[PDB]
Amino acid sequence: EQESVKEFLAKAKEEFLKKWESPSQNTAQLDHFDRIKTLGTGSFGRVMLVKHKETGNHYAMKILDKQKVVKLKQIEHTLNEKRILQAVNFPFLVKLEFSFKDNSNLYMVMEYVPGGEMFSHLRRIGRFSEPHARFYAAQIVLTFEYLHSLDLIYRDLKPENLLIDQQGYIQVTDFGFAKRVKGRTWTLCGTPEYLAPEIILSKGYNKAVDWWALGVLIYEMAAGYPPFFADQPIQIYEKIVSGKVRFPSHFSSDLKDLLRNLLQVDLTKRFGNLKNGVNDIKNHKWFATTDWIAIYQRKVEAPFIPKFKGPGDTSNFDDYEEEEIRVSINEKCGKEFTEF
Ligand SMILES: C#CCN(C)Cc1nc(C2(O)CCNCC2)cs1
Ligand SMILES: C#CCN(C)Cc1nc(C2(O)CCNCC2)cs1
């Protein structure tokens, strides 16, 4: 609305498109780093703390096995992830420093954020007060304003993907489902508790699914548990498509009103997806105390600072079996990953 916001977003889009159209490639190699510790694992990849041998700097290295990426139908998703991360720039997104590939794997070398996942702190404290939840939610609102103005949808908002930095601010990690979308998209993906009804029903869907997921995240931060849950995914999906939501009595009236408009099952009536876009959220009464410019500038004192001893501390992450990073003598899946 204000011309200063319009010109900020226009410059952000110009700088994104220049890097999008000419991506960087092949900017390091594996024997430039020492392996320290496994920080997370999944069905086709893992994340490892590493140290660069010449500079001494620490990084979070995401390692993807090419053969498993193909088998689980993730080729286009992994190419989206790396092409988007090398082109974006925003205070609340983890930065990609290097990328490269070898006979067996794809590598994305990110900044290391030592404070841990928001999920760990939420479960240890029980629930966040409304001011504490609001500080984190404001950073997500600004991040989605940025991403959506570049025609990007994020599609994986949840507490495990939000890391807490040395200042107590959020860094969003894991762009494995992020995509450049000018109209609608159709892939079934995401985590069950956070999916909007139009994903579950196999519709063509848009950026409104990120604003639904922000309603699930704010509910989970302020209550301690998500609004839709069950033992089996089909039962979760039945609750989501009903959209019946019960709120704890300790929620303020302003919080309940915001959540009824983000958790709106009709996508054409959902906040974030109306004529006024993000400003229906930024101007809602639950955000009346938020200084949007001071949050962007990192000038607000955070609700807490994680406890850690230095840039290589891993005490806020958990323990996994330590496995080899094997590189085959023969090249695998070369054609499929030519652009990486
Ligand atoms: C290889 C090959 C030919 N396949 C039909 C290609 C395939 N594409 C998929 C997608 O889910 C990838 C994400 N965009 C939507 C389609 C699954 S299988
Ligand atoms: C708290 C509590 C009680 N549970 C029934 C709550 C639940 N929490 C989950 C999640 O693990 C899903 C993924 N992100 C974080 C929360 C599933 S069911």
Asked if residue 208 and residue 139 are part of one domain, the reply reads yes
Q: Please identify, by atom number, the ligand 1 atom nearest to the C-alpha of residue 73.
A: 17
Tell me: do 105 and 220 sit in the same domain.
Answer: no
Considering the domain architecture, whether residues 175 and 92 belong to the same structural domain is answered as: no
Strand order through the sheet with 45-52: 33-41, 45-52, 58-65, 105-111, 96-101
Quote the tokens at residue 258. Answer: 């915001």
Helices (H) and strands (E) in the chain, counts: 11, 9
- Known catalytic residues are 156
What CATH code is carried by the domain that includes residue 48? Answer: 3.30.200.20
| Dihedral of alpha carbons 120, 97, 339, 186, sign | positive
Say which residues have a Cβ less than 8 Å from residue 28's Cβ, sequence separation at least 6: 98, 99, 100, 107, 109
> Cα 296 from chain centroid?
17
Closest Cα to residue 195, out of 143, 145, 237?
237
Indicate whether residue 11 lines ligand 1 (CB < 6 A): no
Convert 54-76 to b/e letters by CB count within 10 Å (16 or more is b): eeeebbbbbbbbbeebbeeebee
Query: Residue 40 annotated as binding?
Result: yes
* 8 CB neighbour count, 10 Å cutoff: 15
212 and 110, same domain (yes or no)? no
187 lines ligand 1 (CB under 6 A): yes
107 and 129 together in one domain: no
Cα–Cα distance for residue pair 83/331, rounded to 1 Å: 22
User: Does the beta carbon of 72 sit less than 6 angstroms from any atom of ligand 1?
Assistant: no
Q: Do 16 and 152 have their domain in common?
A: yes
Which range marks the domain in which residue 195 is found?
A: 5-22+117-307
Task: Give the pair of three-digit tokens for residue 173.
Answer: 């990690």
Q: What is the DSSP code (8-state) at residue 5? A: H
Closest-lying ligand 2 atom to the alpha carbon of residue 230: 18
Neighbours of 3 (CB within 10 A): 7
Q: Which ligand minimizes its atom distance to the CA of 233? A: 2
Write the DSSP symbol of residue 259.
H
Compute CA distances 300 → 16, 144, 304, whole Å. Answer: 27, 20, 12
Residue 228, both tokens: 């839709």
76 in ligand 1 pocket by Cβ < 6 Å? yes
Ligand nearest to the CA of 177: 1
Rounded to 10 degrees, what is the CA torsion of 149, 153, 158, 161?
-80
Q: Whose CA is nearest to atom 6 of ligand 2?
A: 225
Tokens at 281, concatenated: 């959220």
How far are the Cα atoms of 88, 90, 179 from residue 146, in angstroms, in the given order? 9, 8, 14
Ligand 1 centroid distance, CA of 75 (Å): 8
User: Which one of 76, 77, 189 would you pick to mutate in the ligand 1 pocket, going by the greatest count of ligand atoms within 8 A of its CB?
Assistant: 76
Cα 267 to Cα 264: distance, rounded to the nearest angstrom: 7
Enter the tokens of residue 84.
Answer: 């988007």
The separation between the first and the last C-alpha atoms of the chain, rounded to the nearest angstrom, is 38
Structure tokens at 241: 């498509």
In the chain, how many domains are there? 2
Elucidation technique: X-ray
Task: Show Cβ contacts of residue 55 under 8 Å, excluding neighbours closer than 6 positions.
Answer: none
Distance CA 278, CA 266 (A): 17
- Looking at the fold, whether 104 and 224 belong to one and the same domain comes out as no
Q: What's the CATH number where 299 sits? A: 1.10.510.10
For 37-41, the CB contacts below 8 A with 24+ separation are 37/314, 37/317, 37/322, 38/320, 38/321, 38/322, 38/323, 39/314, 39/317, 39/320, 40/317, 40/320, 41/320
229: Cβ below 6 Å to ligand 2?
yes
User: What is d(CA 173, CA 95) in angstroms, rounded to the nearest whole number?
Assistant: 9
